Design a binder for this molecule. Sequence first.
Ligand SMILES: CC(C)CCC[C@@H](C)[C@H]1CC[C@H]2[C@@H]3CC=C4C[C@@H](OC(=O)CCC(=O)O)CC[C@]4(C)[C@H]3CC[C@]12C
Lengths: 24, 318, 101, 70, 18, 93, 38, 35, 40
Amino acid sequence: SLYFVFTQLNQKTFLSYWLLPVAG
Amino acid sequence: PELPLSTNRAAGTQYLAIGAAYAVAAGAVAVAALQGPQLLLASPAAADPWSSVLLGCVAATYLRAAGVFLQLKAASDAAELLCWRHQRLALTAAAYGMVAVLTQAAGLASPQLLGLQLLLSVASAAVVANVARSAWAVTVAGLLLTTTIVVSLYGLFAAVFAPAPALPVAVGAWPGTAAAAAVMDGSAAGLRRLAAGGLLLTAAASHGLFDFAGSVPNPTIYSLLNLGFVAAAVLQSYFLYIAPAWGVNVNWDTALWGPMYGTAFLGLVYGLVALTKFDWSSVVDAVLRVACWFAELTMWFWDTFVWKFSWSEKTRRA
Amino acid sequence: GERIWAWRNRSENERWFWEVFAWDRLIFPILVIVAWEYLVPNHLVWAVLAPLALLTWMSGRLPTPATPEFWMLAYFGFYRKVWPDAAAWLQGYVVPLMGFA
Amino acid sequence: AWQQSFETYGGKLREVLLGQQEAAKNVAKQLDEGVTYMDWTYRSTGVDLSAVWDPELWIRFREAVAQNEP
Amino acid sequence: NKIKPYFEAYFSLNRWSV
Amino acid sequence: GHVARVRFYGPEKNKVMATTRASAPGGERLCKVVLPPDPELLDHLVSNGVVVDTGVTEDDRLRASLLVQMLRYTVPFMVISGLFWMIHTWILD
Amino acid sequence: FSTITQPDTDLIARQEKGTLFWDIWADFLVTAADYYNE
Amino acid sequence: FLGWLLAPGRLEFYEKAACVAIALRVLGIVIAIST
Amino acid sequence: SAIIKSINNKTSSEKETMQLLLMSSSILLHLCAIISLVSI
Ligand SMILES: CC(C)CCC[C@@H](C)[C@H]1CC[C@H]2[C@@H]3CC=C4C[C@@H](OC(=O)CCC(=O)O)CC[C@]4(C)[C@H]3CC[C@]12C
C-alpha cells in the first residue's frame, strides 16, 4: 500500500557518489 | 428449450459418421503420400516429391480434422453444443467449408479434390446449418495456441488472397527441357489452397481448444484430441525433416513452407507444454535462479577486485 | 521572530520535502542510474544483471515492477543497450522457426 | 583418490583425442593464441584485458615450462 | 552470501528522517 | 626473408611479435619489437612474404578502457591489504 | 566526520574476538557448570 | 608498483615481522601445551 | 587556461553550464578520493 517512490541508496554506503564525478 | 435425446443421438451419428469418414480419408491420403501424388490428380506435373510431401501434410491436417469431429462427438455426450464457444466453433466449422468452396471457386485443380472435399464440406455445411437452427431456437499453453491462431490465420490471409507467387527463371538454365524458365502449373494452385484449407481447419481447431481449455467445459476430454493435435504435427515435421533429403526446395517460396515449419514446430512445442507443464511461474523461477547466481558472482567480484565490503559499509559501536 | 513562527507553522510538508526527500530519494537515484548506464558497455551482464545485484545490496530490497527502480533500469539499460541488438538476433534466429519469415 | 581418477580418465581421453587428432591440434593453436594475447576479452566480458596483459612474459613462461629452464 | 535471501524470499532506515 | 609472421599487439599496436624462420640464426624464436613511426615498414613487410596479423582494435576507446582502468586503480589496495593480512593474521592467528 | 570516528582495526578485532570469547564459549560454560552442579 | 612494493627496506620489515610472528605463534603453542 | 579555453571553444548560456560542470566534477573527485581513503 506504499507509494511509487525511490528508496535511499546511501543509508548503507557512499560508493555511489564515485559515479557522479566520473561521468561528469 | 434443452436438447432432447433424439437431437442428441442424431448429432452423435452425424459427427461420428463424418469423423470416421474423415479418418478413413486421412488414412487414404496418407497411403497416397506414401506411394504417389498423381493418385488424386490427372495433370502431368504430378511426378514431383513436394506434391507428395504437401499431400502428407494435408493427410496430417485430415487426421486433425477427424479428431475435431470425434471431439465434437465427445462434447455431444453431455449435450454441450449450446455453449456460445461451441456455437462459435460450429460457425467456424461452417466458414471452413465456405472458404474451401471459395478457394476451389478461385481455382480447382483436381476432380478428386472436388469430390473428396465437397463431400466432406457440403455434408458439414448442411449439418451446421441445421444445428445452428437447432441451437438458435433455444499460461504458455494459451500463448502457444493463440500464436498458432495468429500464424495460421495470417497464412490463410496471405494464401487465399493472392493468386500465386512466381518461381525464379534462373536465366539460361537449359533453355529446352527440365521445366526451367516456365510458369507455375495449375497442378499446384489447388495444392496451395488445400494446404491453406488444412491450415485453416487446424487454426479453428486451435482456437476451439484455446477458448475451451481457457479454464485450465471438459478439462480432460481433449486428451483424445490431444493425440490428434500433437502427434500428426510432429509427424508433419518429420515429412519436412525429410524434405531436404528429397531435395525439395522450401526456402524460395513464402506462403507454403513458412506456416508449415511454424505450425509443426509449434505443435511439438505444445507437446512440450504438455510434456513438462510449465507453470508460467517456473520459467520465472529459472530467471530468478540465474539472477541469483549472477548476483553471487558479482558480489564476489566486487569484494575481491574493486573494494572490500568491510571498507564500504559503515561499522557501529564506536 | 513572529513572522518566522507563522511561516514555520504553514510549511511543514515543503520543509520535509526539501530536507529529506529532494536529493536522497528523487534526484540522486535518477542521476546514479543514468550515469551508470552512460558508462558500462552495451552487454547484458553489465547493463542489467550487475545493476540489479548492486541496487538490492545498496537499497536493501529487490526492484520489482511495483517500484520505479525496476522501470528505470528496464527502460534505460534494457531498451537502449541490449534490445537494439537482441532484436536483430531474434529476427534472425527464432522468427524463422515460426510461420512468417 | 585423485590418481584413481587420473588412471580412469586417461585411457578414455587418450583414445578420444587420438580419434580426431585434426581439430585437437588446431583447438590447441586457437586456445594458445587466445591465451597469449588476451584480445578476446572485451566482447566476451566487457573488460579489455589486453592493456595490462603481457604476451612476452607468458611466452617466456611457456618456453621455461617446456624446456625446464626457469 | 549477503544478497541470496532477497531472492530466496521470492522464488519460494534512518529514523532521523521521520 | 627470415621472419614468417608478425602480430601487431598492444592497445595502441606499436609492438609486434615476430616469428623467426628456421633459416634464422639460432633457429625458431619469438621476439618482441617496439617500432618507431616509420611509414615505410608495411610495404617492406608485405613485399617479402610476411604474414601480418592485427588485433581487433576495439573501436570505442573510453568504453573499452573504463573498467580496466578502474581495476588498475583499485587492485593495488587489495594487494597491499592481502600481503599485510597474510603476515599479520595467517601466522599469529 | 562520521567516517573518521568509526572503530579502527584494534577495536574491531577486540569486538569480534571478544564476542567469540564471551558470549558463545562462556554460555556453554555456564550450561556445563549448572548441569554438572575456589 | 612492484618495484616500490618490494623495496629492500620493505623487504627487511616484512622479514622481521614474519620472524616475530612465527616466534610468537610457536611460543604461544608451547605455553598452551604446557597447561 | 588551455583547459577552460577548450571547454569554452568546442562545446544561449551553454559555456557557463559546461564550466560549472567541470568545477563540480573536480571538487567532487578530490572529496571522494579523500573519503574513500580514510574509509580504511
Ligand atoms: C518543485 C520540484 C522539484 C518538483 C517537486 C515534485 C514533488 C512534489 C513530487 C515528485 C514525485 C512526487 C511523488 C510521486 C508519486 C506519488 C504517489 C502518488 O500517490 C497518490 O496518488 C496518493 C493518493 C492519496 O492517497 O491521496 C502521489 C504522491 C507521491 C508520493 C508524489 C508526491 C509528490 C512528489 C514527491
